Write a protein that holds these residues in place. Structure first.
Motif, PDB file in Angstrom:
ATOM      1  N   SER A 148       0.849  -1.184   0.000  1.00  0.00           N
ATOM      2  CA  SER A 148       0.000   0.000   0.000  1.00  0.00           C
ATOM      3  C   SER A 148       0.876   1.222   0.000  1.00  0.00           C
ATOM      4  CB  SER A 148      -0.955   0.033   1.208  1.00  0.00           C
ATOM      5  OG  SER A 148      -0.175  -0.168   2.372  1.00  0.00           O
ATOM      6  N   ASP A 149       0.382   2.307  -0.565  1.00  0.00           N
ATOM      7  CA  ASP A 149       1.184   3.531  -0.604  1.00  0.00           C
ATOM      8  C   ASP A 149       1.080   4.305   0.697  1.00  0.00           C
ATOM      9  OD1 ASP A 149       1.691   2.921  -3.274  1.00  0.00           O
ATOM     10  OD2 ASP A 149       0.464   4.593  -4.022  1.00  0.00           O
ATOM     11  N   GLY A 150       2.116   5.064   1.012  1.00  0.00           N
ATOM     12  CA  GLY A 150       2.090   5.964   2.131  1.00  0.00           C
ATOM     13  C   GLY A 150       1.386   7.263   1.809  1.00  0.00           C
ATOM     14  N   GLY A 151       1.232   8.096   2.832  1.00  0.00           N
ATOM     15  CA  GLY A 151       0.635   9.391   2.615  1.00  0.00           C
ATOM     16  C   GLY A 151       1.543  10.425   1.954  1.00  0.00           C
ATOM     17  N   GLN A 152       0.949  11.473   1.406  1.00  0.00           N
ATOM     18  CA  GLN A 152       1.719  12.557   0.791  1.00  0.00           C
ATOM     19  C   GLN A 152       2.580  13.273   1.829  1.00  0.00           C
ATOM     20  OE1 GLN A 152      -0.163  15.817  -1.693  1.00  0.00           O
ATOM     21  NE2 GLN A 152       0.074  16.961   0.227  1.00  0.00           N
ATOM     22  N   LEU A 153       3.858  13.493   1.521  1.00  0.00           N
ATOM     23  CA  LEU A 153       4.762  14.145   2.448  1.00  0.00           C
ATOM     24  C   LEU A 153       4.921  15.626   2.138  1.00  0.00           C
ATOM     25  CD1 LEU A 153       7.398  11.294   2.642  1.00  0.00           C
ATOM     26  CD2 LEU A 153       5.451  11.687   4.226  1.00  0.00           C
ATOM     27  N   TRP A 154       4.514  16.063   0.953  1.00  0.00           N
ATOM     28  CA  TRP A 154       4.587  17.477   0.558  1.00  0.00           C
ATOM     29  C   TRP A 154       3.728  17.654  -0.684  1.00  0.00           C
ATOM     30  CZ3 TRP A 154       7.259  16.412  -3.978  1.00  0.00           C
ATOM     31  CH2 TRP A 154       8.299  15.443  -3.944  1.00  0.00           C
ATOM     32  N   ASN A 155       3.325  18.886  -0.949  1.00  0.00           N
ATOM     33  CA  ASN A 155       2.492  19.173  -2.076  1.00  0.00           C
ATOM     34  C   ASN A 155       3.248  18.881  -3.338  1.00  0.00           C
ATOM     35  OD1 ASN A 155       0.143  20.263  -3.283  1.00  0.00           O
ATOM     36  ND2 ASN A 155       1.194  22.219  -3.611  1.00  0.00           N
ATOM     37  N   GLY A 156       2.616  18.143  -4.246  1.00  0.00           N
ATOM     38  CA  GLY A 156       3.277  17.740  -5.474  1.00  0.00           C
ATOM     39  C   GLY A 156       3.828  16.318  -5.429  1.00  0.00           C
ATOM     40  N   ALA A 157       3.779  15.663  -4.273  1.00  0.00           N
ATOM     41  CA  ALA A 157       4.160  14.248  -4.197  1.00  0.00           C
ATOM     42  C   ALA A 157       3.378  13.413  -5.212  1.00  0.00           C
ATOM     43  CB  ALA A 157       3.897  13.730  -2.825  1.00  0.00           C
ATOM     44  N   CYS A 158       4.015  12.395  -5.801  1.00  0.00           N
ATOM     45  CA  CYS A 158       3.343  11.682  -6.890  1.00  0.00           C
ATOM     46  C   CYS A 158       3.859  10.257  -6.984  1.00  0.00           C
ATOM     47  CB  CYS A 158       3.610  12.419  -8.221  1.00  0.00           C
ATOM     48  SG  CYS A 158       2.764  11.743  -9.664  1.00  0.00           S
ATOM     49  N   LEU A 159       2.935   9.301  -7.031  1.00  0.00           N
ATOM     50  CA  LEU A 159       3.250   7.908  -7.414  1.00  0.00           C
ATOM     51  C   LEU A 159       2.338   7.457  -8.564  1.00  0.00           C
ATOM     52  CD1 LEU A 159       3.895   6.085  -3.976  1.00  0.00           C
ATOM     53  CD2 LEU A 159       5.632   6.867  -5.608  1.00  0.00           C
ATOM     54  N   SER A 160       1.897   8.421  -9.381  1.00  0.00           N
ATOM     55  CA  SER A 160       0.912   8.164 -10.444  1.00  0.00           C
ATOM     56  C   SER A 160       1.370   7.136 -11.468  1.00  0.00           C
ATOM     57  CB  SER A 160       0.530   9.453 -11.177  1.00  0.00           C
ATOM     58  OG  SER A 160      -0.230  10.278 -10.326  1.00  0.00           O
ATOM     59  N   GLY A 161       2.686   6.928 -11.587  1.00  0.00           N
ATOM     60  CA  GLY A 161       3.227   5.898 -12.457  1.00  0.00           C
ATOM     61  C   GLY A 161       2.648   4.532 -12.170  1.00  0.00           C
ATOM     62  N   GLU A 162       2.105   4.339 -10.972  1.00  0.00           N
ATOM     63  CA  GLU A 162       1.599   3.039 -10.553  1.00  0.00           C
ATOM     64  C   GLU A 162       0.401   2.566 -11.385  1.00  0.00           C
ATOM     65  OE1 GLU A 162       0.923   3.872  -6.406  1.00  0.00           O
ATOM     66  OE2 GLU A 162      -0.796   5.223  -6.885  1.00  0.00           O
ATOM     67  N   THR A 163      -0.241   3.448 -12.139  1.00  0.00           N
ATOM     68  CA  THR A 163      -1.316   2.984 -13.018  1.00  0.00           C
ATOM     69  C   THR A 163      -1.061   3.256 -14.476  1.00  0.00           C
ATOM     70  OG1 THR A 163      -2.523   5.017 -12.837  1.00  0.00           O
ATOM     71  CG2 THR A 163      -3.030   3.241 -11.273  1.00  0.00           C
ATOM     72  N   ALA A 164       0.145   3.649 -14.818  1.00  0.00           N
ATOM     73  CA  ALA A 164       0.444   4.026 -16.198  1.00  0.00           C
ATOM     74  C   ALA A 164       0.828   2.809 -17.045  1.00  0.00           C
ATOM     75  CB  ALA A 164       1.592   5.000 -16.188  1.00  0.00           C
ATOM     76  N   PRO A 165       0.527   2.851 -18.346  1.00  0.00           N
ATOM     77  CA  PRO A 165       1.134   1.865 -19.252  1.00  0.00           C
ATOM     78  C   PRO A 165       2.651   2.018 -19.212  1.00  0.00           C
ATOM     79  CG  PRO A 165      -0.726   2.998 -20.282  1.00  0.00           C
ATOM     80  CD  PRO A 165      -0.379   3.788 -19.038  1.00  0.00           C
ATOM     81  N   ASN A 166       3.349   0.976 -19.618  1.00  0.00           N
ATOM     82  CA  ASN A 166       4.786   1.039 -19.583  1.00  0.00           C
ATOM     83  C   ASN A 166       5.358   2.169 -20.425  1.00  0.00           C
ATOM     84  OD1 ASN A 166       4.853  -1.217 -17.924  1.00  0.00           O
ATOM     85  ND2 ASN A 166       5.770  -2.571 -19.448  1.00  0.00           N
ATOM     86  N   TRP A 167       6.551   2.625 -20.083  1.00  0.00           N
ATOM     87  CA  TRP A 167       7.284   3.564 -20.916  1.00  0.00           C
ATOM     88  C   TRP A 167       7.418   2.976 -22.332  1.00  0.00           C
ATOM     89  CZ3 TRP A 167      11.595   3.828 -16.697  1.00  0.00           C
ATOM     90  CH2 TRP A 167      11.434   4.978 -15.910  1.00  0.00           C
ATOM     91  N   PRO A 168       7.321   3.818 -23.365  1.00  0.00           N
ATOM     92  CA  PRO A 168       7.159   5.273 -23.266  1.00  0.00           C
ATOM     93  C   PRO A 168       5.709   5.659 -22.984  1.00  0.00           C
ATOM     94  CG  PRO A 168       7.292   4.564 -25.559  1.00  0.00           C
ATOM     95  CD  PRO A 168       7.542   3.363 -24.762  1.00  0.00           C
ATOM     96  N   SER A 169       5.537   6.576 -22.025  1.00  0.00           N
ATOM     97  CA  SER A 169       4.244   7.100 -21.568  1.00  0.00           C
ATOM     98  C   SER A 169       4.550   8.136 -20.498  1.00  0.00           C
ATOM     99  CB  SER A 169       3.344   6.018 -21.000  1.00  0.00           C
ATOM    100  OG  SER A 169       3.996   5.491 -19.852  1.00  0.00           O
ATOM    101  N   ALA A 171       3.137   9.822 -16.692  1.00  0.00           N
ATOM    102  CA  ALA A 171       2.280   9.842 -15.522  1.00  0.00           C
ATOM    103  C   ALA A 171       2.662  11.058 -14.673  1.00  0.00           C
ATOM    104  CB  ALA A 171       2.381   8.509 -14.778  1.00  0.00           C
ATOM    105  N   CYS A 172       3.625  10.947 -13.755  1.00  0.00           N
ATOM    106  CA  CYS A 172       4.015  12.123 -12.965  1.00  0.00           C
ATOM    107  C   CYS A 172       4.669  13.187 -13.832  1.00  0.00           C
ATOM    108  CB  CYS A 172       4.965  11.721 -11.836  1.00  0.00           C
ATOM    109  SG  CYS A 172       4.236  10.619 -10.611  1.00  0.00           S
TER     110      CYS A 172
END
Ligand SMILES: CC(CCO)CCO
Length: 180
Positions: A148-169, A171-172
Protein backbone atom coordinates in the motif's frame (compact mmCIF):
# COMPACT_ATOMS: atom_id res chain seq x y z
CA UNK A 1 11.88 10.98 -22.94
CA UNK A 2 11.00 14.62 -22.28
CA UNK A 3 13.99 16.37 -20.71
CA UNK A 4 16.46 13.98 -22.34
CA UNK A 5 15.97 11.35 -19.61
CA UNK A 6 16.57 7.71 -20.59
CA UNK A 7 13.45 5.79 -19.63
CA UNK A 8 13.02 2.34 -21.18
CA UNK A 9 10.62 -0.41 -20.08
CA UNK A 10 13.33 -3.12 -20.21
CA UNK A 11 17.07 -3.20 -19.98
CA UNK A 12 20.20 -4.07 -18.07
CA UNK A 13 20.88 -2.62 -14.65
CA UNK A 14 23.14 -2.75 -11.65
CA UNK A 15 21.67 -3.23 -8.18
CA UNK A 16 22.62 -2.25 -4.62
CA UNK A 17 20.78 -1.92 -1.31
CA UNK A 18 20.09 1.20 0.71
CA UNK A 19 18.49 2.06 4.04
CA UNK A 20 16.01 4.69 5.06
CA UNK A 21 13.41 5.07 2.31
CA UNK A 22 10.56 6.56 4.35
CA UNK A 23 10.84 10.07 2.93
CA UNK A 24 11.82 9.46 -0.68
CA UNK A 25 12.15 11.80 -3.64
CA UNK A 26 8.72 11.04 -5.11
CA UNK A 27 7.19 12.43 -1.88
CA UNK A 28 5.27 9.27 -0.92
CA UNK A 29 6.77 6.11 0.50
CA UNK A 30 5.20 2.74 0.00
CA UNK A 31 4.69 -0.15 2.31
CA UNK A 32 6.06 -2.95 0.12
CA UNK A 33 9.24 -3.51 -1.90
CA UNK A 34 10.64 -0.23 -3.21
CA UNK A 35 13.65 1.15 -4.97
CA UNK A 36 15.45 4.29 -5.97
CA UNK A 37 16.46 4.57 -9.63
CA UNK A 38 19.39 6.45 -11.12
CA UNK A 39 18.70 10.13 -11.95
CA UNK A 40 18.91 9.71 -15.74
CA UNK A 41 15.94 7.32 -15.49
CA UNK A 42 14.17 8.93 -12.51
CA UNK A 43 13.21 11.99 -14.54
CA UNK A 44 14.00 14.76 -12.06
CA UNK A 45 16.88 16.31 -10.16
CA UNK A 46 17.31 16.76 -6.39
CA UNK A 47 14.86 19.37 -5.17
CA UNK A 48 12.65 19.41 -8.27
CA UNK A 49 10.06 16.92 -7.08
CA UNK A 50 8.78 13.68 -8.58
CA UNK A 51 9.99 12.35 -11.93
CA UNK A 52 8.21 10.05 -14.34
CA UNK A 53 9.73 6.90 -12.79
CA UNK A 54 7.63 7.57 -9.66
CA UNK A 55 5.21 4.81 -8.84
CA UNK A 56 6.18 2.54 -11.75
CA UNK A 57 6.78 -1.13 -10.96
CA UNK A 58 9.67 -3.24 -12.20
CA UNK A 59 10.66 -6.89 -12.03
CA UNK A 60 14.36 -7.05 -11.14
CA UNK A 61 16.55 -10.11 -11.80
CA UNK A 62 20.19 -10.38 -10.74
CA UNK A 63 22.60 -12.77 -12.50
CA UNK A 64 26.15 -11.53 -11.79
CA UNK A 65 28.12 -10.08 -8.89
CA UNK A 66 30.64 -7.54 -10.33
CA UNK A 67 32.55 -7.57 -7.00
CA UNK A 68 32.70 -11.36 -6.83
CA UNK A 69 32.95 -12.09 -10.50
CA UNK A 70 33.80 -15.79 -9.87
CA UNK A 71 30.36 -16.41 -8.31
CA UNK A 72 27.89 -18.44 -10.38
CA UNK A 73 24.99 -18.63 -7.95
CA UNK A 74 22.64 -19.01 -6.36
CA UNK A 75 21.35 -15.56 -6.95
CA UNK A 76 18.34 -14.21 -5.15
CA UNK A 77 14.82 -14.12 -6.33
CA UNK A 78 13.28 -11.90 -8.95
CA UNK A 79 11.39 -9.16 -7.09
CA UNK A 80 8.83 -6.56 -8.11
CA UNK A 81 9.63 -3.08 -6.76
CA UNK A 82 7.77 0.18 -6.90
CA UNK A 83 10.10 3.13 -7.61
CA UNK A 84 9.67 5.76 -4.95
CA UNK A 85 13.07 7.40 -4.87
CA UNK A 86 15.98 9.02 -6.71
CA UNK A 87 19.62 7.96 -6.76
CA UNK A 88 21.26 11.27 -7.76
CA UNK A 89 24.34 11.43 -9.97
CA UNK A 90 25.94 13.65 -7.30
CA UNK A 91 27.42 11.46 -4.59
CA UNK A 92 26.68 8.21 -6.49
CA UNK A 93 29.12 8.23 -9.36
CA UNK A 94 29.88 4.50 -9.41
CA UNK A 95 26.32 3.22 -9.75
CA UNK A 96 24.10 6.21 -10.54
CA UNK A 97 26.42 8.44 -12.58
CA UNK A 98 24.74 7.80 -15.93
CA UNK A 99 24.41 11.13 -17.80
CA UNK A 100 23.64 12.29 -21.28
CA UNK A 101 27.46 12.58 -21.83
CA UNK A 102 28.17 9.05 -20.49
CA UNK A 103 25.00 6.97 -20.27
CA UNK A 104 26.49 3.93 -18.52
CA UNK A 105 27.88 3.66 -15.02
CA UNK A 106 31.23 2.19 -13.91
CA UNK A 107 29.82 -1.32 -14.35
CA UNK A 108 28.71 -0.56 -17.90
CA UNK A 109 25.06 -0.47 -16.92
CA UNK A 110 22.64 2.13 -18.36
CA UNK A 111 20.28 1.87 -15.30
CA UNK A 112 20.64 1.26 -11.58
CA UNK A 113 18.17 0.32 -8.86
CA UNK A 114 18.93 0.82 -5.17
CA UNK A 115 16.63 -1.63 -3.44
CA UNK A 116 15.39 -0.43 -0.06
CA UNK A 117 16.30 -2.75 2.83
CA UNK A 118 13.62 -1.39 5.20
CA UNK A 119 10.64 -3.10 3.57
CA UNK A 120 12.35 -6.41 2.75
CA UNK A 121 13.22 -6.08 -0.96
CA UNK A 122 16.96 -6.35 -0.51
CA UNK A 123 16.85 -9.48 1.62
CA UNK A 124 14.78 -11.19 -1.06
CA UNK A 125 17.00 -10.13 -3.94
CA UNK A 126 20.61 -10.26 -2.71
CA UNK A 127 22.10 -13.63 -1.71
CA UNK A 128 23.79 -13.41 1.69
CA UNK A 129 27.25 -11.90 1.30
CA UNK A 130 26.56 -10.12 -1.96
CA UNK A 131 25.74 -6.42 -1.93
CA UNK A 132 26.01 -5.56 -5.59
CA UNK A 133 24.66 -7.36 -8.64
CA UNK A 134 23.98 -6.76 -12.31
CA UNK A 135 21.14 -8.23 -14.35
CA UNK A 136 17.92 -7.18 -16.01
CA UNK A 137 14.78 -5.23 -15.34
CA UNK A 138 11.38 -5.22 -16.94
CA UNK A 139 8.63 -2.76 -16.21
CA UNK A 140 5.51 -4.65 -15.17
CA UNK A 141 1.99 -3.91 -14.13
CA UNK A 142 1.66 -2.82 -10.52
CA UNK A 143 -0.86 -5.66 -10.27
CA UNK A 144 2.35 -7.65 -9.63
CA UNK A 145 3.44 -5.40 -6.73
CA UNK A 146 2.28 -6.05 -3.15
CA UNK A 147 1.56 -3.41 -0.55
CA UNK A 148 0.00 0.00 0.00
CA UNK A 149 1.18 3.53 -0.60
CA UNK A 150 2.09 5.96 2.13
CA UNK A 151 0.63 9.39 2.61
CA UNK A 152 1.72 12.56 0.79
CA UNK A 153 4.76 14.14 2.45
CA UNK A 154 4.59 17.48 0.56
CA UNK A 155 2.49 19.17 -2.08
CA UNK A 156 3.28 17.74 -5.47
CA UNK A 157 4.16 14.25 -4.20
CA UNK A 158 3.34 11.68 -6.89
CA UNK A 159 3.25 7.91 -7.41
CA UNK A 160 0.91 8.16 -10.44
CA UNK A 161 3.23 5.90 -12.46
CA UNK A 162 1.60 3.04 -10.55
CA UNK A 163 -1.32 2.98 -13.02
CA UNK A 164 0.44 4.03 -16.20
CA UNK A 165 1.13 1.86 -19.25
CA UNK A 166 4.79 1.04 -19.58
CA UNK A 167 7.28 3.56 -20.92
CA UNK A 168 7.16 5.27 -23.27
CA UNK A 169 4.24 7.10 -21.57
CA UNK A 170 3.68 9.88 -19.03
CA UNK A 171 2.28 9.84 -15.52
CA UNK A 172 4.01 12.12 -12.96
CA UNK A 173 6.12 13.67 -15.76
CA UNK A 174 9.76 14.64 -15.93
CA UNK A 175 11.18 17.77 -14.36
CA UNK A 176 13.89 19.88 -15.87
CA UNK A 177 16.66 18.51 -18.03
CA UNK A 178 18.55 15.25 -17.63
CA UNK A 179 22.05 15.37 -16.05
CA UNK A 180 24.94 15.89 -18.45
C1 LIG B 1 19.20 6.06 -3.26
C2 LIG B 1 19.93 7.10 -2.44
C3 LIG B 1 18.93 7.93 -1.63
C4 LIG B 1 19.46 9.20 -0.99
O1 LIG B 1 19.99 10.09 -1.97
C5 LIG B 1 20.90 6.43 -1.50
C6 LIG B 1 21.98 5.67 -2.24
O2 LIG B 1 22.79 4.98 -1.31
Amino acid sequence: ATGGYVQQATGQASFTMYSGCGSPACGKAASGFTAAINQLAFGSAPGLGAGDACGRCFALTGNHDPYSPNYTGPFGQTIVVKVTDLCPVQGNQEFCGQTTSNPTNQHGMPFHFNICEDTGGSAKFFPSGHGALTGTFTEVSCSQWSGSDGGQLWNGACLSGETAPNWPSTACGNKGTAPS
